[PDB]
C-alpha cells in the first residue's frame, strides 16, 4: 500500500526500455532534418528522454500521467508511418507490447494504495 512506490518502478522500466534495441528510434526527439514533413503530421512530439526528464524533475503526479505520454510515442509512430509494415513502425509495436505487459502491475498497485488510503 506504498503510494510513492510507482516512481522507482517507472525509473527501472525506463532503464529496461533504453537497453532494448527496439527503443533506438524513440530515445530522442524525431530528427526534423531526416524527416522534414514530421510536424505537418504530428502536433505533439514525444520521446523516452523527455518522459524520463519529466519523471526525474518531479513533474508527474501519478503513473497514469507517465503512461499517457509513453502511449503518445506509440500513437505518433502509427500516425507518421507510411506503411504498417515499415521497419520503425514494427519496432514501435514490439516495444508497446513490452511496455503494456510491465506497466499493468505499476498502475494496479498505485490505485490499490490510493483506495487503502481513502478507506
Ligand atoms: O520511415 C518510417 O517508416 C517511419 C515510421 C515511423 C516513424 N516514427 C518516427 S520516425 C518514423 C519513420
From Swiss-Prot:
Domain of life: Eukaryota
Subcellular location: Nucleus
Modified residues (Phosphothreonine): 44
Modified residues (Phosphoserine): 90
Domain Bromo span(s) in chain numbering: 1-106
Tissue-by-tissue expression: Expressed in myeloma and epidermoid carcinoma cell lines.
Quaternary structure (record): Interacts with IRS1 and IRS2. Interacts (via bromo domain) with acetylated lysine residues on histone H1.4, histone H3 and H4 (in vitro).
Recorded disease: Chung-Jansen syndrome: An autosomal dominant disorder characterized by developmental delay, intellectual disability, autistic features, anxiety, hypotonia, obesity, and dysmorphic features.
Function of the molecule: Probable regulator of the insulin and insulin-like growth factor signaling pathways. Stimulates cell proliferation through regulation of cyclin transcription and has an anti-apoptotic activity through AKT1 phosphorylation and activation. Plays a role in the regulation of cell morphology and cytoskeletal organization.
Protein name: PH-interacting protein
Organism, scientific name: Homo sapiens
Encoding gene per record: PHIP
Amino acid at each position: 500500500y506504498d503510494i510513492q512506490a510507482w516512481k522507482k518502478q517507472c525509473e527501472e522500466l525506463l532503464n529496461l526500455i533504453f537497453q532494448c534495441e527496439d527503443s533506438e528510434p524513440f530515445r530522442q526527439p524525431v530528427d526534423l532534418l531526416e524527416y522534414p514533413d514530421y510536424r505537418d503530421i504530428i502536433d505533439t512530439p514525444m520521446d523516452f528522454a523527455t518522459v524520463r526528464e519529466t519523471l526525474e524533475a518531479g513533474n508527474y503526479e501519478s503513473p497514469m500521467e507517465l503512461c499517457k505520454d509513453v502511449r503518445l510515442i506509440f500513437s505518433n509512430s502509427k500516425a507518421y508511418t507510411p506503411s504498417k509494415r515499415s521497419r520503425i513502425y514494427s519496432m514501435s509495436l514490439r516495444l508497446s507490447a513490452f511496455f503494456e505487459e510491465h506497466i499493468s502491475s505499476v498502475l494496479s498497485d498505485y490505485k490499490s494504495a490510493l483506495r487503502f488510503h481513502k478507506r
